[PDB]
Design a protein around this ligand. Structure first.
Ligand SMILES: Cc1cc2nc3c(=O)[nH]c(=O)nc-3n(C[C@H](O)[C@H](O)[C@H](O)COP(=O)(O)OP(=O)(O)OC[C@H]3O[C@@H](n4cnc5c(N)ncnc54)[C@H](O)[C@@H]3O)c2cc1C
Length: 498
């Protein structure tokens, strides 16, 4: 069971790495714990929508859940389900719930497709050891092109009922002296226009996104992974989860990999060895594999930085109740297109996505996913008893994030005479959701747990390629940064190590 290169996971870091490895002539095997999402379900579609969730919506849960912010309207469609290898996984830690994708393409399957480059001045602040010129002159443009990032037509956006929710918030923010910015996306906007005209099957305009899009969204399986398979040097094995990693007696790596069926039944456990090992299991997955390896003694030379520096990208969700004369619309595209930019690198910085709501009826609610600058970091500690990495993060650690998000929206509320909603996240009268995360960043920080290109400290031919490399914050939606950084890392690695 030997393969020259093995890539764990099939998310952004993994996809970029596998493509370049394949192009360099290196036979590569990608191991993905989730499924290859290409089989039509009971409704004839691959993915379930947000108004008709079923077992495909969740990674081994016994009941469906409403998208955060829409419980009041979507709980009615929740149903009990059989634990299944679904597409969206809500990982519950002590005081933090991290949402991640499971399947070929990782988070690209369930994300909002928002492709945004971080502010250069901020990138230079968070990663001082990295050459920012190479990043902005070469790697970011490369990522933009490969990801198939596109831009919404302004005339269509301005006239369509599907983005009224966005225009309402723009107007409200404008009164507080705040401006908005268009957010590039991997969802084909031309296709979206055709959806509204009833010319093609709807996806974004049919309340679909978080459990996958049956059309329009150019997830990784269609971009990087498709190209990787096209090299003829890359293979992908699904429902294969790597459990342990060790260094063979000669410098290479051996992995224990469990193969399961969609019901989670263990079919077999196999040994896979390789020369080059790339981890792309995400901020949670890669960090867990390494903290486990260190603490169980299979990779004893890993440093103390492994597991540290985790941050939720300052993720905070909040909502405002609009005046009766400012309805947000019953028809809201599932793909965000506008955001409020109030990020200047200071502590009050906030970059907020104007989030659509799937209710399907007028609620007058404006939803926002704020990205803030909070210095608090958590640490993944290995629990040998349960063989699980535990995230040491407490809810109060998000206080700075809530404070920044509140200060911004308070300005908008003041300028418009509106108030927050306090009932969207539960019965505790909370206006700010502070214990969830869509953008997990850190755990195997670049330059700390690894060198400046992701080479894991203490080992040769061992690499980390994903969100675990980011120092807990990027100030914008993270996948373009993860992709660009991965392009930079693998190119150097192939040149010097391979
Ligand atoms: C609901 C939601 C909305 C978001 N919206 C946006 C957005 O619009 N724009 C944006 O920029 N970002 C967004 N994100 C975040 C973005 O999706 C993630 O930052 C990105 O996917 C992280 O890439 P990654 O390569 O680190 O890992 P991931 O994409 O998470 O992928 C890791 C992969 O490894 C697999 N895996 C894990 N452990 C193992 C193992 N042991 N063995 C085998 N396989 C393994 C996982 O199943 C998964 O497929 C969103 C995420 C969510 C949850």
């Amino acid at each position: 069971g030997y393969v020259p290169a093995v890539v764990i996971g099939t998310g952004y870091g993994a996809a970029v790495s596998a493509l370049r490895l394949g192009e360099a002539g290196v036979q590569t095997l990608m191991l993905e714990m989730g499924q290859l999402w290409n089989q039509p379900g009971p409704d004839g579609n691959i993915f379930c929508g947000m108004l008709n969730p079923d077992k495909r919506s969740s990674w081994f849960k016994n009941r469906t859940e409403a998208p955060l912010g829409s419980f009041l309207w979507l709980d009615v469609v929740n149903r009990n389900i059989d634990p299944y290898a679904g597409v969206l996984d809500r990982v519950n830690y002590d005081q933090m719930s991290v949402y991640v994708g499971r399947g070929v393409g990782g988070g690209s399957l369930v994300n909002g497709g928002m492709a945004v480059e971080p502010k250069r001045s901020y990138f230079e602040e968070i990663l001082p050891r990295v050459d920012s010129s190479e990043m902005y002159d070469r790697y970011f443009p490369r990522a933009n092109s490969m990801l198939r990032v596109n831009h919404i037509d302004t005339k269509w956006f301005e006239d369509t009922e599907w983005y009224k929710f966005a225009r309402v918030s723009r107007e409200q923010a404008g009164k507080a002296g705040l401006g908005t910015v268009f957010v590039p996306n991997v969802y084909d906007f031309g296709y979206m226009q055709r959806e509204a005209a009833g010319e093609v099957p709807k996806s974004a305009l049919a309340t679909e996104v978080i459990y996958g899009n049956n059309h329009g969204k150019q997830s990784l399986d269609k971009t990087y992974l498709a190209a990787a398979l096209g090299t003829g040097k890359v293979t992908i094995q699904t429902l294969h989860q790597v459990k342990t990693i060790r260094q063979t007696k000669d410098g290479g790596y051996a992995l224990t990999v469990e193969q399961k069926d969609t019901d989670g039944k263990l079919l077999a456990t196999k040994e896979i060895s390789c020369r080059y090992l790339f981890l792309g299991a995400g901020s949670l997955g890669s960090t867990e594999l390494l903290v486990r390896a260190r603490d169980t003694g299979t990779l004893p030379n890993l440093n103390s930085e492994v597991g540290a520096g985790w941050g939720p990208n300052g993720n905070i969700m909040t909502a405002r109740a609009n005046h009766m004369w400012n309805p947000t619309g019953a028809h809201q595209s599932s793909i965000p297109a506008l955001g409020i930019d109030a990020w200047d690198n200071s502590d009050s910085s906030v970059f907020a996505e104007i989030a659509p709501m799937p209710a399907g009826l007028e609620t007058w609610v404006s939803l926002y996913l704020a990205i803030t600058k909070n210095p608090q970091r958590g640490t993944f500690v290995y629990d040998a008893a349960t063989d699980r990495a535990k995230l040491n993060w407490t809810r109060d650690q998000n206080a700075p994030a809530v404070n920044a998000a509140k200060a911004l929206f308070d300005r908008i509320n003041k300028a418009n005479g509106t108030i927050y909603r306090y009932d969207l996240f539960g019965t505790q009268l909370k206006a700010f959701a502070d214990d969830f995360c869509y953008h997990p960043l850190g755990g195997c920080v670049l330059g700390k747990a690894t060198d400046d290109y992701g080479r894991v400290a203490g080992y040769k031919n061992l690499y980390v390629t994903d969100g675990s490399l980011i120092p807990g914050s990027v100030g914008v939606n993270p996948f373009v940064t993860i992709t660009a950084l991965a392009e930079r890392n693998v190119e150097r690695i192939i040149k010097q190590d391979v």
